[PDB]
Amino acid sequence: QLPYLVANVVEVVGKAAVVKTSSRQTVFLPMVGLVDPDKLKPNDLVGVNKDSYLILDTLPSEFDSRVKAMEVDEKPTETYSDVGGLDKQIEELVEAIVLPMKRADKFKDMGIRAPKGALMYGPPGTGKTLLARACAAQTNATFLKLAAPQLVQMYIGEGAKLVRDAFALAKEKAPTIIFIDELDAIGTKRFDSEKSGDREVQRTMLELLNQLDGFSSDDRVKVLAATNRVDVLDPALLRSGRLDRKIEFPLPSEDSRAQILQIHSRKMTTDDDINWQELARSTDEFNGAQLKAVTVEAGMIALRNGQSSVKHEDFVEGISEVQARKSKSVSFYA
Amino acid sequence: MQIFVKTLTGKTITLEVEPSDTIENVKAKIQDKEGIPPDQQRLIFAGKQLEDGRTLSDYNIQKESTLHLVLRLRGG
Amino acid sequence: LKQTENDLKDIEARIKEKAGVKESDTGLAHPLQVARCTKIIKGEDAKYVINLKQIAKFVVGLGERVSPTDIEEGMRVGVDRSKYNIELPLPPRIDPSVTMMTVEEKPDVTYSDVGGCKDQIEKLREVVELPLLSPERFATLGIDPPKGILLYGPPGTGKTLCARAVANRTDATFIRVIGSELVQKYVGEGARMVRELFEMARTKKACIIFFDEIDAVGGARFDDGAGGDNEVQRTMLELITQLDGFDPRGNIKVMFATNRPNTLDPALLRPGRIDRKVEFSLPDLEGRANIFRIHSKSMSVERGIRWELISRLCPNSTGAELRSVCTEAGMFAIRARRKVATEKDFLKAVDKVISGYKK
Amino acid sequence: QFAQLPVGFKNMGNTCYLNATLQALYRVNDLRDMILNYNPSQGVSNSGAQDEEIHKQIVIEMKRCFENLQNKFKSVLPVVLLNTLRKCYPQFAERDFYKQQDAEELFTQLFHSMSIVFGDKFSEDFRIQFKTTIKDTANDNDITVKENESDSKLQCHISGTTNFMRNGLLEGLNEKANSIYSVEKKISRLPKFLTVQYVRFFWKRSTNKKSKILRKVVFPFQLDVADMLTPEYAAEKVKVRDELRKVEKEKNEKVMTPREQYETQVALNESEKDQWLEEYKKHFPPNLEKGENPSCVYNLIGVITHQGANSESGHYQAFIRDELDENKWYKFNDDKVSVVEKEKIESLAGGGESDSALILMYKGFGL
Amino acid sequence: REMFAYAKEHEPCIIFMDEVDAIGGRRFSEGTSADREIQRTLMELLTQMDGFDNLGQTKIIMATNRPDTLDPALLRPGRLDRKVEIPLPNEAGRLEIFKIHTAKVKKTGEFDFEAAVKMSDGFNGADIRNCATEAGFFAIRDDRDHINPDDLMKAVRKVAEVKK
Amino acid sequence: ILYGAPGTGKTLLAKAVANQTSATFLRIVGSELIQKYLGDGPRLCRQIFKVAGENAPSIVFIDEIDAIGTKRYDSNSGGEREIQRTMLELLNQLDGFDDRGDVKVIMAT
């Protein structure tokens, strides 16, 4: 019965055995078969008497709090029928990760190893996050958002352990995408003598890679890192078992904007006359997120006008107003 | 005949009874499949709380009727 | 009088309290960041024993417990930053923040100008005012109202005053985080504050989170760190994530302030971060006039003032400068000992203010 | 200066269950009026009740209590009423002070007595009729529809999943050779006064003892139950609701001593209120039954709260909405009466050991 | 202390130090935040070395990407004396590694590794592996577990172009 | 803002006026705030303003501010950002609150 004493061991006349309790105290018990050999395994809670100091029973594994840096979302709700117009970024993404996961057996018979990883850089504001979750849904991966600043602990090692726990759960839950918010805290270590300070970040990264190539032939876990733009890092783009693949996001084109507009126009009322292709010619160098902000502005015209839908005009006027990154309205010069 | 008792969890369960059964008998049948002690059961039907010595026929509780089972929040 | 009534209150309070202590002694015994019931005799699993700490652990997977109503024990209790969870004995509030920030419920500064800031106010009105007054309008259209606003030109242009005024009208909280303070030089500390601000934000939804100065923090990211852009980008990049990552739109507002426009990144510009760009930069002649007219109503004045004339002497202003002309004009009068303001005084205040601004 | 605070009942020791219940009943205008105008010469409606005389005495003693509340007697001691109630319903004479009691049980018995004395005139204001659909879970061609079930309150079932009153009300409308049958109620007639019971008290199996569910369950100030109605009845009630909403919106658009001026303003405010009642009433449906809600919408007018471990411990209070100023609420903590704001009422949804809503009273929109 | 004692018992041993900047920095900027923990570590390694205990059946191998966040102590002979650098390959090195990688692999056709080598300029084993899988990608598409000579020529070139 | 010179006229005016209003003259060394590490100054500044408003009316005398008298168009690194964080903190507190004489400032240079 709880309250009970657990012990977190990290240790792998007659025979002596050392137990490490989480009260950070080493204790003597014998391993003469009064205490069975199968009640010790590292990394694991095992159940020790309070004042008799002896392993009666073994309890499930745990080291720190469970899912401490990790968000768990079993299977996103998104699809590539929800996220669409991003089609080329779907092709790259599918060839690097999805096909090694699906056809794992095929990679084994072929007798190459599987790449497990990609690195993405290039602009979001198009549904980069949204695409990542789509891939997650499609492959039937568990989506794990792991935030790179949480590891980066000011305390000793604990961060290193967190990287290992991530792999451990990821391998149990397989298929899995480990989706890494930032790249600034498993990276940005520079090449100067300030790479000293930035140790915690070199160590979290190194381990995650060492661990992937450790298991490169089997495609169970995927690693994806995301940023606006590529940062200084240790070499890792040169190797299948690391994050081999380096995937670029470009900007949309007329076909892509128009699909993105048709996805937008299901959600919200329209007067069902609005021509995406025509509006798409009228917007120059727009991204997906910005076509979504035009829909909001088109509705702000509508809000003032006393309309509950939007006509073509209502959208044209929406574009003229700011979306804050690019807006087509230029006609001034005398 | 078969009647219904909406338990505390919001669920309806069924009970097999006779127009001659008393509210004490019914409460015993409820204890059997729900596990609540009769002395803790308050049964409502048609806005009336059912008294222990009366019978289902007294209240005109026919087949498929639904009784509402409630406990008590003592205070004063 | 005042003394007898204070004692009478103590006596009354105390008796209830003494009884209550003994009851607490017999059982051997909400914000919170881990739960810690340090014993648990009362209460897969069919009973609670939950205690989240490095040095020991008691783990039960199953919360609830409408009888006994759990809690008690070695008291920090509720939901966990590990999700074992005190689910629902005495109010948890989703991992609720013990790290504070400055809250100003209903900030009081109503409507400094309503004329000559005419368009800029109206932008605020669509985004912020109307979606609190009617959520159903917005819903019916199917649009989601601007998540974030960027306010530009110099800060303290009466930028603050206007923002506060709409917040009063709607009865909404100002949540002030000042960019400059965050700056620590210890591992991860700033970004940690940011996560807890948003968790706290979701709980408190209907709030304008004011982020002072993006010149301060998140000013570059093109460096790939430097020790002082590396915590600073860490905090920054984390803060964006949270925003596109969803917080409710039409409740929680984030307002950014900036003096200079060279700090901005493509990351910052994009929707789900900034959608609005509201001006508080340079107004018109007709406009300068309205803001002058507006501050001098409250004042007594003796006749011969035309606002147009006062406006004329400004070759370029910001809202800050205008506020300085009315208030400075009043000072020349007080030195001479006066309650009234004159055309001469207003001219004298324009000449001083503009010339100091130069260079 | 001139506005007098309502008065409350002194607690005789564990009799706040009665006090809170009497304030809630007093707030129900039609009930208050029929009690205040009761003449013992009128007898009872149901003289089939063998204990007729004691039910009449309960009403007489309630009328005396109500006369003292109406005519503000800074404190009312309901001693004779308690004695009378105990004679009729000996459960309330249990000791261990007398034992604390479940306000729901008192409410139920008072309703029984008022139905005996007043008959349909009382009970029709509270009646909810159901259409019940009974389907064999094992066979969806075996379908039976009954129209004869009714009650005088709705139960809000609370489990660990329950977060809003609606959740619990919906669960309360459903329940489950021999087979398992689903029994599904939809409302075919709504009352002008709608009583909602939060099912908080229960028999704990683990301890063989009375307990209480503390879970937070948010209730609305304006309740719309269109989704609980039969399709046919919803169509009727929604049509009414949409006309009433139009009136509400139009409403929201629009030498004497100091004492005399206050009394004139009260008279003015009552007249203005009556003129708006008449405007809503223009839109009531032609064949509305006496006591029936015109629409599917209600406003909250009263809340009976409890704080404590179970129904035989702790304390009951009432929170009552002011009859003219809809933003104003009174807290009746036995004889200690105070004014509170809407935020305090919202906090009564519960969570932990806090005072929380147990019984809610709603009155139809436009009444 | 434990790591060294156990090395002596369990000698021969490789002690492999993964990215040395954290136990062998230089200082952040000459300043300190946590870069004194780094100094506490670093003095202990220099002490074992300088000591009466001598390295010869316990070998220590340090690894780091850059030598520009190694301490000057280490760069001085007698705490490291052997410094192996990772070079550009020969034409000969590339051939062997292409042949080895495609030996475990299933293929139609004898492969001319010699072309493949020309199509690189100094690919070490990791770079060569990316080329292998690349060929394999057109084979998953061509619905096969085999690869042509033809795939292999295209594959080495696409990997070269996308980096150095 | 008073500009003149120490012991010549700047200081004299400040002693004289502060005493006349019978407020606590609370003397801050501008340059020493100057602490050259990311954490020290903006807090120091916040802590000043806080205690002043509490125990009002109070004089925040900032002696010889010369070194956060720069503004920059873009901020980078620690070496430009530190300076700018301290400058911005003063600017925001002023812009953030308004007081008719819970806090009075004399700035000196």
Residue of C nearest to D206 (CA): C67
Helix axes D103-118, D79-88, angle to 10 degrees: 80
Both structure tokens of A282: 């009228």
Annotated binding residue at F8? yes
Per-residue DSSP letter, A194: T
Q: Do C49 and A228 touch (CB under 8 A)?
A: no
In contact, F44 and F86? CB cutoff 8 Å: no
Quote the CA–CA distance of E68 and B9 in Å, as a whole number. Answer: 69
Type of residue numbered C337: R
| Listed resolution, Å | 9.5
> What is the domain extent for residue B54?
1-76
Q: CA-CA-CA-CA torsion for D270, D272, D277, D283, nearest 10 degrees?
A: 170
Burial, D87: exposed, middle or buried (Cβ in 10 Å; 0-12, 13-18, 19+)? middle
Both structure tokens of D166: 């609606």
- N residues, chain E: 164
Q: Which of A64, E137, F80 is nearest to C226 (CA)?
A: F80
- Residue with structure tokens 């939809």? D186
Q: How many domains does chain B have?
A: 1
Cis upstream peptide for A3 (omega within 30°): yes
CA angle in degrees (0–180, nearest 5) for A133-A138-A140 = 90
D236, β-bridge pairs: none
CA-based radius of gyration for chain A: 26
Q: Which of C79, C258, C281, C102 is nearest to C174 (CA)?
A: C102
Burial, A59: exposed, middle or buried (Cβ in 10 Å; 0-12, 13-18, 19+)? middle
Per-residue DSSP letter, E88: P
In contact, A247 and A96? CB cutoff 8 Å: yes
**Beta strand A70-74 pairing with A142-147:** antiparallel
Q: What SS3 state is found at A148?
A: helix
Of D112, D157, D306, D315, which is the active-site residue?
D315
**Beta strand D75-76 pairing with D8-9:** parallel
Quote the CA–CA distance of D237 and D298 in Å, as a whole number. Answer: 12
What sign has the CA pseudo-torsion F60, C153, C265, C172? Answer: positive
Both structure tokens of A183: 């790249």
Annotated binding residue at F9? yes
In contact, F96 and C176? CB cutoff 8 Å: yes
Type of residue numbered D283: H
Q: Do C66 and D206 touch (CB under 8 A)?
A: no
Quote the CA–CA distance of C109 and C268 in Å, as a whole number. Answer: 29
CATH at B16: 3.10.20.90
Quote the CA–CA distance of E62 and D281 in Å, as a whole number. Answer: 90
Q: Which of C48, C76, C51 is nearest to C63 (CA)?
A: C48
D60's CB contacts (< 8 A; 6+ apart) are D38, D40
For chain E, the maximum distance between any two Cα atoms, rounded to a whole number of angstroms, is: 65
Buried b (16+ CB within 10 A) or exposed e, C226-238: bbbbbbbbbbbbb
Buried b (16+ CB within 10 A) or exposed e, A272-284: eebebeebbeebe
Quote the CA–CA distance of A9 and A20 in Å, as a whole number. Answer: 5
Q: What SS3 state is found at A274?
A: coil
- Alpha helices in C41-104, H assignment, sequence order: none
Residue C189 belongs to what H/E stretch?
A: helix C189-203
- Residue B24 phi/psi, 5° resolution? -70, -40
List, as one string, the DSSP characters of B29-43: HHHHHH---GGG-EE
Q: Which of D123, D188, D194, D187 is nearest to D364 (CA)?
A: D194
CB atoms within 10 A of CB C13: 10
Q: CA-CA-CA-CA torsion for C262, C268, C269, C274, nearest 10 degrees?
A: -120
Buried b (16+ CB within 10 A) or exposed e, C124-150: beebbbbbbeeeebbeebbbbbbbbbb
Residue of C nearest to A185 (CA): C234
Annotated binding residue at A41? no
Q: Which of F52, C140, E10, C48 is nearest to A299 (CA)?
A: C140
Burial, D364: exposed, middle or buried (Cβ in 10 Å; 0-12, 13-18, 19+)? buried
B23's CB contacts (< 8 A; 6+ apart) are B43, B50, B51, B52, B53, B54, B55, B56
Could you tell me which chains touch chain E, where touching means 3 or more CB pairs under 8 A?
A: A, C
In contact, D23 and D8? CB cutoff 8 Å: yes
Quote the CA–CA distance of D323 and E6 in Å, as a whole number. Answer: 85
Q: Which of D151, D156, D152 is nearest to D200 (CA)?
A: D156
Residue D351 with chain C: CB contacts under 8 Å? 88, 90-91
Q: Do D160 and C89 touch (CB under 8 A)?
A: no
E28's CB contacts (< 8 A; 6+ apart) are A193, A194, A196, A197, C227, E35
Q: Which of E155, E148, E150 is nearest to E131 (CA)?
A: E155
Provide the shortest C-alpha distance from residue C241 to chain E (in Å). 28
Phi-psi region at C142: left, alpha or beta (left = phi > 0; alpha = psi -120 to 50): left
C148's CB contacts (< 8 A; 6+ apart) are C243, C253, C254, C255, C256, C272, C273, C274, C275, C276
Both structure tokens of D154: 């709705």
Beta strand segments in C41-107, E: 51-52, 57-58, 102-105
- Give Cα C251 distance to the centre of its chain: 13
- Alpha helices in chain A, H assignment, sequence order: 87-93, 99-102, 104-110, 128-139, 148-151, 159-173, 199-213, 254-267, 276-282, 288-305, 312-320
Quote the CA–CA distance of C274 and C253 in Å, as a whole number. Answer: 11
Q: Which of C327, A241, D345 is nearest to E133 (CA)?
A: A241
Quote the CA–CA distance of E54 and A129 in Å, as a whole number. Answer: 55
B55, β-bridge pairs: B22
Q: How many CA atoms lie within 13 A of C94 on its CB side?
A: 10
Residue C34 with chain A: CB contacts under 8 Å? 65
In contact, C260 and C214? CB cutoff 8 Å: no
3-state secondary structure chain D: CCCCCCCEECCCCCCHHHHHHHHHHHHCHHHHHHHHCCCHHHCCCCCCCCCHHHHHHHHHHHHHHHHHHHCCCCEECCHHHHHHHHHHCHHHHCECCECCCCHHHHHHHHHHHHHHHHCHHHHCCCCEEEEEEEEECCEEEEEEEECCCEECCEEEECCCCCCEHHHHHHHHHEECCCCCEEEEEEEEECECEEEEEEECEEEECCCCEEEECCCCCECCCEEECHHHECHHHHHHHHHHHHHHHHHHHHHHHCCCCHHHHHHHHHHHHHHHHHHHHHHHHCCCCCCCCCCECCCCEEEEEEEEEEECCCEECCEEEEEEECCCCCCCEEEEECCEEEEECHHHHHHHHCCCCCCEEEEEEEEECCC
Residue C322 belongs to what H/E stretch?
A: helix C319-336
A91's CB contacts (< 8 A; 6+ apart) are none
Quote the CA–CA distance of C169 and C163 in Å, as a whole number. Answer: 10
What sign has the CA pseudo-torsion D134, D135, D136, D141? Answer: positive
**Beta strand B42-45 pairing with B66-70:** antiparallel
Both structure tokens of C335: 């030195």
| D315 counts as catalytic | yes
C119's CB contacts (< 8 A; 6+ apart) are C279
Quote the CA–CA distance of C220 and C236 in Å, as a whole number. Answer: 10
Using the Cβ of E33 and the Cβ atoms of chain C, whether some distance falls under 8 Å is answered with yes
Q: Do B64 and D159 touch (CB under 8 A)?
A: no
In contact, D322 and D330? CB cutoff 8 Å: yes
Q: How many CA atoms lie within 13 A of F81 on its CB side?
A: 34
Type of residue numbered A65: S
Residue D348 with chain C: CB contacts under 8 Å? none
Type of residue numbered A231: D
Buried b (16+ CB within 10 A) or exposed e, D320-335: bbeeeeeeebbbbbbe
CA-based radius of gyration for chain E: 23
Quote the CA–CA distance of C75 and C71 in Å, as a whole number. Answer: 7
What sign has the CA pseudo-torsion A50, A56, A57, A58? Answer: positive
Both structure tokens of B56: 């289902």
CA angle in degrees (0–180, nearest 5) for E64-E69-E73 = 100
Type of residue numbered B71: L
Type of residue numbered C50: I
Residue C349 belongs to what H/E stretch?
A: helix C343-357
Both structure tokens of C123: 């932008």
What sign has the CA pseudo-torsion C166, C171, C172, C178? Answer: positive
Quote the CA–CA distance of F63 and F6 in Å, as a whole number. Answer: 9
Of D16, D65, D156, D296, which is the active-site residue?
D16
- Give Cα B13 distance to the centre of its chain: 11
Quote the CA–CA distance of A319 and E127 in Å, as a whole number. Answer: 47
In contact, A193 and E28? CB cutoff 8 Å: yes
- Residue C110 phi/psi, 5° resolution? -85, 130
Quote the CA–CA distance of D109 and C201 in Å, as a whole number. Answer: 47
Q: What SS3 state is found at E132?
A: helix
Per-residue DSSP letter, C36: B
Q: Name the interface residues of C facing F (CB cutoff 8 Å).
A: 109, 155-156, 159-160, 176, 178-181, 183-186, 212-213, 215-217, 219-220, 223, 226-229, 231-232, 259-260, 262-263
| D16 counts as catalytic | yes
| CA dist F73 → D132, F67, F80 (Å) | 74, 17, 11
CB atoms within 10 A of CB A225: 24
Annotated binding residue at A126? yes
Type of residue numbered C355: S
In contact, B34 and B13? CB cutoff 8 Å: yes
Both structure tokens of D50: 């063998």
Q: Which of C26, C27, B72, B38 is nearest to D308 (CA)?
A: B72
**Beta strand D297-307 pairing with D315-321:** antiparallel
Per-residue DSSP letter, F108: B
SS3 content of chain F, % helix, strand, coil (to 5): 40, 15, 40
- Residue with structure tokens 């819903």? C139
- Give Cα D317 distance to the centre of its chain: 14
